[PDB]
C-alpha cells in the first residue's frame, strides 16, 4: 500500500520488519561500464549479491533498502534478478547521486523537470518495469553544496511533498553538508522526521550528530565496516553515547556495503587495511552483541531496525 | 595502415579524401539513457543519422570524423550500423568529454590509468569490437581548466606520444581555454601540428584565433549552423579574414552537427531561432559557395577539407 518493493507486492509500513536502511547490491559508473563492459562480470556480481543477501536474511534481516540511483548504476532488472533467488524485501529508490555537477543533459533545465524524473519513478515505475521507487536519494560531499548539488536537493524537497515518499541523503561527516542538507529541505516544507542524514557516523563529534537529531531528522550511523572513515570500535562508542543520551528513537544503523563496487579507490584487493570486516552482516557479529553487552535492551535494537524505519516510511 | 576506421579496413592518410573533421551521429548522456531508455528511439536516431550521412556523401564528403566519446554516448555498435547502410569512412576516437569533474570511478586514480583507457581503444579496440580509435578527444568550457579537466588533458598528451594518434579539443571561444589546452599539451611533448583547438570559430576575435594558429596547431572553425554561438554570416567573414591572411593551411571546417542530441538546451523544437540551417551539409549550401564567390581558389577548399586533415593524421 505505502511502501513499494521489487518483484513483489507493495507492503504497508508496519509489516516492514527488521530492515537494513542502507545497502548496495552493486554500484558502477554508467558511462564507463556502458563504454567498456569487458571490465565487468554480470555473474561475479550476481553471486556476491545473492550470497551476501541470503546471509543477511539469516541473522533475521527482513527488508533491505538499496539507495542505488543515477551515478551509482541503478539496475532494476538486476535487482529483481537477486530478489527472486533470495526472496528479499528490497525497497528501490530514485534521485541522483552527485558531488559537483549534473550530466550535460541537465544543462539549462529547471529544477521541476528534475523532480519530474523522480516523480516518474515513484508513480509510473522505474525504467519502465513497473517497480516503483520508495524514496529519493541525494548526495553532498567534500565539495559541499554547490549549484548543481543544491538543485537536486530542492528537487527532492518537491518530489517529497508531491509523492509523500521519504528522502535519504549522502553527506560528508566533518563538513556540515549534512546540516546544510537538512536545512535546505526543511525550508521547503520537508518533514524532518522524513529525512535521513547519512554517514554522520564517520565522525566522533557527537554534538554535530545531536543537533541534527535534535532538528527532528533521522541520523545516519550507516557505514559500519568502513574503518577508513572510522574504525568499528570508534563507531560503537558513538552509537553507545547517543543511546544513553536517549537518541535511539532517531538512530538508524547499516553498512553501506557494496557487493561489487566500481571505484578504484575501493578495489577488492584494498579491502584489508581499509575495511577488513566490512560486510552485509557485520553489525550482527560485532555491533549488536556489543550493545546488549553494554546494557542496551532488546527494545532499542527492535526500535532502531524496526520502529524507526516504520516511522520513516509513513 | 595509419588511420583506423569503422566496419572497414584502415586507410593510410593520403586516401582520406574530403573530410568533415567534426560531426556527431548522435549524442546522449550514458547515465539517463541507461536508466530511462523510454525517452529514446533507436529507430528515429538511426534514420536521421543514415539520412544525414548519405546526403553528405553526395556533396562529395568522403570521410566523416566523429568525436563522440565517454559523456557523449559513444556507441561503436551503433556506428557500424549506419556505416553499413551508407558506406561512409567514419573515424572513431577515444578520450573523455567533460567540463568540471570525472565520474566517481576516477576517484583516487592516476593520470596514467586514464591514458591507459585511451591507449586501450587505440591498439586493442573500442568496446571490444576491434574497431580502434583514430584520435583522442578532450573538453574544456566556461568552468575553464580545472583539476579533473587538466588530468584528462595531460592524459591525452601521453596517449599521443605513445600511440602517435592526434588529439581534438573542445573549448570555449571567449575563454582562452583553447590556448590553455594548446599550452598544456605543448609542454608535454605534444606536436602542435597534431592538436585541433575546436569551436574557436564561435568568436569574432581574430587575434585569439591567429596566435593559436601561430602556435602551430589547427584552428577550429567547426560549428557552422549553430547561430547561437555565432551566426553563419558572422562566421563566414572570420574564415574569410584568415584565408586572406594566409592561415588556410591551418583552417579546418565542419558543423558539429548532432543528428539526435540528448541535451534539453538543444531540443528538436529549439532548432529554429537557435540554429535554423544547422545541418551536416550546410557548408556546401552556404559557406563554400561564399568563398569561391569572394575570391578563394579551389586549392584552398581542397587544402582545408583534404590536405589539412591528411597532415593531421600522420
Ligand atoms: Co552514501
Ligand atoms: Co565540441
Ligand atoms: Fe551508499
Ligand atoms: Fe562536437
Numbering used by the authors:
A (entry chain A), B (entry chain A): 1 to 314
Please, what does the article write about this entry?
SisLac belongs to an enzyme family called Phosphotriesterase-Like Lactonase (PLL) that encompasses members from mesophilic organisms (PPH, AhlA, MCP, DrOPH) as well as thermophilic (SsoPox, SacPox, GsP, GkL) representatives. SisLac is a native lactonase that exhibits a high promiscuous phosphotriesterase activity.
SisLac is homodimeric in the crystal structure with overall dimensions of the monomers of being approximately 39×48×56 Å. As for its close homolog SsoPox and related PLLs like DrOPH, GsP and GkL, SisLac is roughly globular and exhibits a (β/α)8 barrel topology. The dimer interface of SisLac comprises 46 residues (44 in SsoPox). The nature of this interface is mainly hydrophobic in both enzymes, but SisLac’s interface tends to be more hydrophobic (56% for SisLac, 52.6% for SsoPox), more charged (SisLac 23.91%, SsoPox 20.45%) and less polar (SisLac 32.61%, SsoPox 36.36%). Q34Y is indeed a key substitution in the interface since it consists in a “pivot” residue, i.e. a residue that contacts its equivalent in the second protein molecule while forming the dimer, and seems to be responsible for the observed dimerization shift between SisLac and SsoPox structures.
